């Protein structure tokens, strides 16, 4: 019956960079998954109150979504590509932990994770 604070997308005392690899994570990886027919459940934080999922955040202590990831990239929040790659991996893992194999939401996540993997495979070497 209440959502937590969302993940921070802004922290002025966190040091930041805008690397070639971070630019690809935006213009290639996030863009690819964002436009997908299965992106919609992943485009903002889990609204456990409207979804009637009052255990979600009992179970899920590290929430992540592509709304967050997107703001983080657009805001220049990260130091490196690995922090961002972690965030996508977290989002996928959380889906798997909470739900049961073969639920529509897990197949959605599986499809996006496949594209994620195809895109990251070609992550450029730093400039
Ligand atoms: C009593 C009540 C209170 C509030 C709302 C409702 C109406 N409705 C009844 C139960 C219904 C449950 N529906 C589901 O689709 C839950 C399945 C798991 O869903 C997700 C699981 C998940 O991991 N993620 C990321 C999602 C992201 C977006 C949308 C859904 C999920 C949604 C709310 C009834």
Mapped to the 3 state alphabet, what secondary structure does the chain carry? CCCCCCCCCCCCCCCCCCCHHHHHHHHHHHHHHHCCCCCHHHCCCCCCCCCCCCCHHHHCCCCCCHHHHHHHHHCCCCCCHHHHHHHHHHHHHHHHHHCCCCCHHHHHHHHHHHHHHHHHHCCCCCC
Specify the number of domains making up the chain: 1
| Experimentally determined by | X-ray
In a domain, 11, yes or no: no
In a domain, 14, yes or no: no
Q: How far apart, in Å, are the Cα atoms of 67 and each of 70, 97, 100, 103, 126?
A: 5, 20, 24, 22, 26
The ligand 1 atom at the shortest distance from the C-alpha of residue 95 is 23
Q: Which among 51, 95, 106 is the best mutation to test ligand 1's pocket, defined by most ligand atoms within 8 Å of the CB?
A: 51
Closest Cα to atom 34 of ligand 1? 52
Count of CA atoms in the C-beta half-sphere (13 A) of 116: 20
Give every CB contact of residue 95 below 8 A, 6+ residues apart in sequence.
105, 106, 109
- Domain with 77 in it: what CATH number? 1.20.920.10
Task: Return d(Cα 116, Cα 33) in angstroms, integer.
Answer: 7
Closest Cα to atom 14 of ligand 1? 51
Resolution (A): 1.7
In a domain, 9, yes or no: no
Residue 34 belongs to domain spanning:
19-123
In a domain, 10, yes or no: no
């Amino acid at each position: 019956s209440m959502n937590p604070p969302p993940p921070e997308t802004s922290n002025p005392n966190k040091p930041k960079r805008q690397t070639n690899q971070l630019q690809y994570l935006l213009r290639v990886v996030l863009k690819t998954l964002w436009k997908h027919q299965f992106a919609w459940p992943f485009q903002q934080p889990v609204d456990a109150v409207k979804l009637n999922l009052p255990d979600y955040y009992k179970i899920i202590k590290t929430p992540m979504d592509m709304g967050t990831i997107k703001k983080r990239l657009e805001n220049n929040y990260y130091w490196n590509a690995q922090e961002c790659i972690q965030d996508f991996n977290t989002m996928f893992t959380n889906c798997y932990i909470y739900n049961k194999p073969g639920d529509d939401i897990v197949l959605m996540a599986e499809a996006l994770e496949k594209l994620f993997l195809q895109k990251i495979n070609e992550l450029p070497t730093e400039e």
